[model samples]
Target: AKELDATNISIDKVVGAGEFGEVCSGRLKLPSKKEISVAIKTLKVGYTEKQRRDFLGEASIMGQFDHPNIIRLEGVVTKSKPVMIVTEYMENGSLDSFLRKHDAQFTVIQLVGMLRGIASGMKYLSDMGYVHRDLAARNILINSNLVCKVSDFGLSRVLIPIRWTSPEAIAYRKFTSASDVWSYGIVLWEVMSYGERPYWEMSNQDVIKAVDEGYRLPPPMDCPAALYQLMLDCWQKDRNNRPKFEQIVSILDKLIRNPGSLKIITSSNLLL
Candidate 1:
């Protein structure tokens, strides 16, 4: 991992916070006196050695990744007081918030485009044998062009959101690319519904019971039936039955190529 000098980083504004510490938008001044915008993730003081190690682990994982749909890690600041992770600053922020702020503004093709981007990113990770156990809309970052990129890798198992988790992962604590497929299904629902919470107000226990009993979530109002079917394919109880990220990309690729196949469903025509 490339270590950077902390003195060269100038935090301009606090963008957000997480379990570790504050995330700030900043400028990284290189030795040549050239400055570049970046997102700085700091490690809070008083954290245990394990916490610090785990926090820095993400930087190691991201440093080797180079994909348009995956957030880029610029460098790390380990030789300083507040251990920091420097990354490219995403202008629009998290995908969930971006969708919620401008609900109903995206066309079906536009939404599908975002999903395709995520699937392609996951496909790349899968090829590398890396499973993003905590795949969700909230973990995706959107840039100014509305292009979505996957972020927040190597999250703790406990930190994962229950709503987006696969049933097997919740029950057996097993995580794999197939489980990521299930989470991707929930993300698809989020994109189609413009950030509506999965499972409405159902309790986690109730959700587990419902899912185990084969009670799949209904299609979001006006959701395309074809897309809903794809979601159902991902929710298959047998992990082996779940579609791979490569297949998902292919399916979405076809949908985008043949736009008319994606038809909006009205209440009158809804089969549910």
Candidate 2:
């Protein structure tokens, strides 16, 4: 990880908080004294080595990548207390929160566009042998242009809720690209439902038991049939049955190009 001079960074205001610590909007001063807006994630005081390592591990992971759809890591401030990980600021915040706050503001293609970007980023990680293990709408961030980027690499693995997790992963700690595909299915449901909970009113334990009994969630209201079918492909009990990220990207690409393929999904006389 690239070490940053803490003295050069100026805190602005708290934008949000996460499981690790507070995330603030801040300014970064370059060597030439030029300042740029950035998001700063700082560790709370009296952190243990394990916490520090897990926090910085996210920076180490982001440090290796240069993808547009993945959050960009600016640098790390380790030479000072309250260590920080700096990254490009995401103006629209997280995908789930953003969608929840502004429901029905997006068209179908626009929603698909966000999912496409996330899938592209995931495909990049999948190609590099990285299993996200925590792919969800809440883990994706959005910039001013409404482009969704994948984030929270380290916190996600340790903190993901069971609703977005795959059965095998919840069962035996198994995680893979296929498992990520399952999580992506949940994310797809989130987007279509305008950030509705995956299994409404169902406890995590019940969700696990229900899925184990061959029960699958129905399509969200107004969801396109083709898109819902893709979601079903992702939630297959057999991991091998889930489409790979590459295939997901391809299917979304085709759907985007031919918007007519997405029909109003109807199940049991209920149109969705």
Candidate 3:
């Protein structure tokens, strides 16, 4: 990872909280003398050696990727008092909050486009042998262009969000690309529902028990039948049965190209 000069960056304001500390929006002046908007994750002062290592460790993990759909890591500033990890600033922030703010305002195709971008990023990660244990709408950042990029790595030490997790992942702590697929299904439901909470106020224990009993989330209002079917495919009980990210990208791409397929609502009660 590149070592950034602290003097070349200017802090703007805090945007959100990160696992280690507060995340801020700032301006970074590149070596070319060009200024660009960026998100800075600062390590709170009075940190232990382990916290510093883990914080920089995330930078190392992010530095290895080079995908358009994946969040880009610009560099790090460690010489400063509060060590910082700088990345491109996403104007719209997280997908969940963004969707909630503009509830039911976008076309289905637009939502699918966002989903496709996320799947493409996940596919790249899976191909690289990296498993993102935490995958949800909250972890996906959206830019001004409406492009969704996967962010927030380093889940090995954090608490998992049970609502988005797969059964096996919650039970055995087994995380894989397939478990990510399961979470993707929940994200799919989230997008379709305009950022409604998964399982809608159900307790974590209830969610786990219900999932064990083959209870799946019903299609979100106005969700396409084909899209809902794809969600079911992702939520398969056997992890091996879940569609791969590569397959998911293809499925979404096909739907985007053939909008008519989404008009056929299969569930009798959900008829238009």
Candidate 4:
């Protein structure tokens, strides 16, 4: 689909593309008649009221946040029917491409930086009482300087108080902070092993079944000893046993300070 270049910026061209058909690069015109680097995110066509609520709410989420790992929502452009969320342009593209192209050459320190970026973003959302239900490698954007930023907020939702006036099996959805932590763990694995997809070779149903049966991604899927161990800690059968985002942040800190000493296992070695 063609992009919505309806902004006054007189876009020269598209620099990249992100999840949900979000344009990663574009021109931002100024009053002095000049163009600057800007990220253009195109909203999905045929959005429902709920989707609109979430999409607009994303601006509130990003606006309320001022973290380095979280993408900055510069502005929103509404023209010709499509809405585009503008952000800072990322020169390095995404974490997925960066890892795919250079995982072999990545140093431990670099890997930790990547992990820290992702953790920081998730930590922010977790703190804000929001859950990024869909967290993954491709969703994380890395700039030219290798600074990571979490993008793609389409599936995000707030976890505020229920405030049920009258109880009626409405089946409201509310994710505890632990669920975000699980997504963070998945993302950490993505960072450490260079963009490995979560749940390798598993169908959506299989992944769901695994989650139901306390199943997690097994070894050999970017299952570095320590990475898988950490994932296990995050993907515990009882979400209560899951570590807090702060704890995961501290682990990333430890990994950053000294990765050699962090010993972990990477296999399905559970004993009944």
Which candidate wins on lDDT?
3
lDDT of 2 at 251: 93
Question: Candidate 4, which segments miss by more than 4 Å at Cα?
Answer: 1-10, 15-24, 29-36, 42-57, 79-83, 160-174, 220-224, 262-272
Q: lDDT per prediction?
A: 0.86, 0.85, 0.89, 0.65
TM-score-best of 1 and 3: 3
For residues 1-272, what per-residue lDDT tens digits would candidate 2 score against the true structure? 77999988899999878667998998999888889889999998888899898889888988777788889888998988889999988998989999999888888999999999999998887777778877888889999999999887773342157888899999998888888999999999899888887887787788888887777778877889888888889989999989999999999999899887775554521112
* Tens-place lDDT digits, model 1, residues 1-272: 78898888999999888889998998998879988889999999988999898999888887767898889888998887789999988898989888999889989999999999999888887777787888989899988787888898876232157888888888988888899899999999889988887887887887888888888877877888889999999999999999999999999999999899887563311122
- Using alpha carbons, what is the TM-score of model 3? 0.93
Q: Check candidate 1 and list the clashing pairs.
A: none
Superposition TM-score, candidate 4 onto the true structure: 0.74
Q: Estimate each model's TM-score.
A: 0.90, 0.90, 0.93, 0.74
The local distance difference test score of model 4 is: 0.65
Cα lDDT tens digits for candidate 3, 48-151: 99999999998888887899999999999888778999998899999999999998899888999999999999999888888888889999999999999999
Candidate 3 Cα lDDT to native: 0.89
- Residue 44 lDDT (model 1): 94
Displacement of residue 37 (Cα, Å) in model 2 is 2.2
Q: Which stretches of candidate 3 lie over 4 Å from their true place?
A: 156-159, 266-272
